[PDB]
Amino acid sequence: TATYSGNPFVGVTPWANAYYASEVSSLAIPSLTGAMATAAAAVAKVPSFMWLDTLDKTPLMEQTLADIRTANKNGGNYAGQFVVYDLPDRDCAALASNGEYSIADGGVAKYKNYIDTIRQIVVEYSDIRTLLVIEPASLANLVTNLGTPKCANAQSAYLECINYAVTQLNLPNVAMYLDAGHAGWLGWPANQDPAAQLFANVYKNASSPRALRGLATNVANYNGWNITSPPSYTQGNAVYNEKLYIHAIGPLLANHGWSNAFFITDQGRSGKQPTGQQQWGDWCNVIGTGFGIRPSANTGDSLLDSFVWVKPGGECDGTSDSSAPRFDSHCALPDALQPAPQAGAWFQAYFVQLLTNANPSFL
């Protein structure tokens, strides 16, 4: 059944979508032989979130859901996972993932249509549990980057927009998780309370929506879950892994008006610890990373509903071509794999490194 009570990941199975499947079978496999080609085909069977990074991405959402309903009618129990990521003046603290909507050019109204569209789809397929991650790298920027004009000037729109999203998608078959950065971002002591206040406020201001089950951490990043050895680049922070991060922020959300908040953590590129990050603040196509802990709700943790793979390994994080559009200097750094295509584009060399460093291994 679609509606739930408790951890939305219990009583359903995460669906591996066709989009990622297609990327691995028609962009990476034809370029591998023997073992690798057989391992890669397995990777595409692991469930990961489909990003709705553009309005014209919604048709694919409807089709993926179209497939699920089908499998579910033939004795199957699957749920859909998608990332809502199309905020006006998106990624305000960086340049690599600039989006299709801008506040100046009627961006807020366009986002409201963007959410309306999506709502109509979850409405149409109310017979399917739909798990959602809401706007990665947005509220987290309001906490630490008000010093960047683009973020400060976008504060009003972000808030308005996110509130429209969380309330407009507040439905019985929906489970939302607001993105909350990660250990290296807001895990720092002085960033903790302020973040807690921010998410608590978003939640309460939306009238404590039932579908809003909690926060998502490490989305598109590489922090480890419960490593017992602090990596060198985390020097100076006692919260150096995601477990320590959610157990530190959980009680604080409760302090500010949000009880029973749970978490899901991205481990799609965490398998290899430590990473080749020269610095903890380097986020672009980091070297020395592999597929990590596989998706599952048997977390062994009181606050984690499930391990997840939100950022699909192999899909670039940004170009390293100084001449190309949307060039973020972070993607030309020594710890970044080069040369890199545009963000969202398939990155064959990266996908191979992840397969070779998978842990659990695929080989």
Ligand X SMILES: *[C@@H]1O[C@H](CO)[C@@H](O)[C@H](O)[C@@H]1O
Ligand Y SMILES: OC[C@H]1O[C@@H](O)[C@H](O)[C@@H](O)[C@@H]1O
Ligand Z SMILES: *[C@@H]1O[C@H](CO)[C@@H](O)[C@H](O)[C@H]1NC(C)=O
State which of residues 20, 82, 280, 283 lies at the interface with ligand Y (CB under 6 A).
Answer: 283
Partner interacting with residue 229 (select from ligand X, ligand Z, ligand MAN, none; CB below 5-8 Å by kind):
none
Is the bond into 149 cis (omega within 30 degrees of 0)?
no
As measured in angstroms, the least distance from the Cβ of 147 to ligand X is: 40
Amino acid at site 314? G
Q: Please give the Cα distance from 40 to 224 (Å, whole number).
A: 23
What does 137 bind: ligand MAN, ligand X, ligand Y, none (CB cut-off 5 to 8 Å by kind)? Answer: ligand Y
Cβ closer to ligand MAN: 25 or 163? 25
Nearer to ligand X, 54 or 342 (CB): 342
Instruction: Determine the interface stretch with ligand Y among 63-71, 90-98, 192-200, 238-246 (rule: CB under 6 A).
Output: 90-98
Q: Which positions touch ligand X (CB under 6 A)?
A: 30-31, 348
The CA distance from 113 to 108, in Å, is 9
Residues 159-198 that bind ligand Z (CB under 6 A): 159-160, 163
Regarding 9 and contact with ligand Y (CB under 6 A), the answer is no
- Residue 96 Cα to chain centre, angstroms: 16
**Where on the phi/psi map is residue 344: left (φ > 0), alpha (ψ -120 to 50), or beta?**
left
Neighbours of 36 (CB within 10 A): 17
From the list ligand Y, ligand MAN, ligand Z, none, partner contacted by residue 53 (C-beta under 5 to 8 A by kind): ligand Y
Number of residues that bind ligand Z (CB under 6 A): 11
Tell me which stretch binds ligand MAN (CB under 6 A): 27-35, 49-57, 297-305, 322-330: 27-35
Nearer of residues 26 and 208 to ligand MAN, judged by Cβ: 26
Q: What tokens were used for 295?
A: 């998706």
Q: Of these partners, ligand Y, ligand MAN, ligand X, none, which one is at the site of residue 344 (CB under 5 to 8 Å by kind)?
A: ligand Y
The item of ligand MAN, ligand X, ligand Z, none sharing an interface with residue 348, based on CB under 5 to 8 Å by kind, is: ligand X
- Rounded least distance, CB 283 to ligand X, Å: 24
44 makes contact with ligand MAN (CB under 6 A):
yes
- Residues of this chain that interact with ligand Y (CB under 6 A) are 51, 53, 91, 93-94, 97, 137, 185, 220-221, 283, 311-312, 315, 317, 343-344
Residues found near ligand Z in the complex (CB under 6 A): 159-160, 163, 201-202, 205, 225-226, 228, 299-300
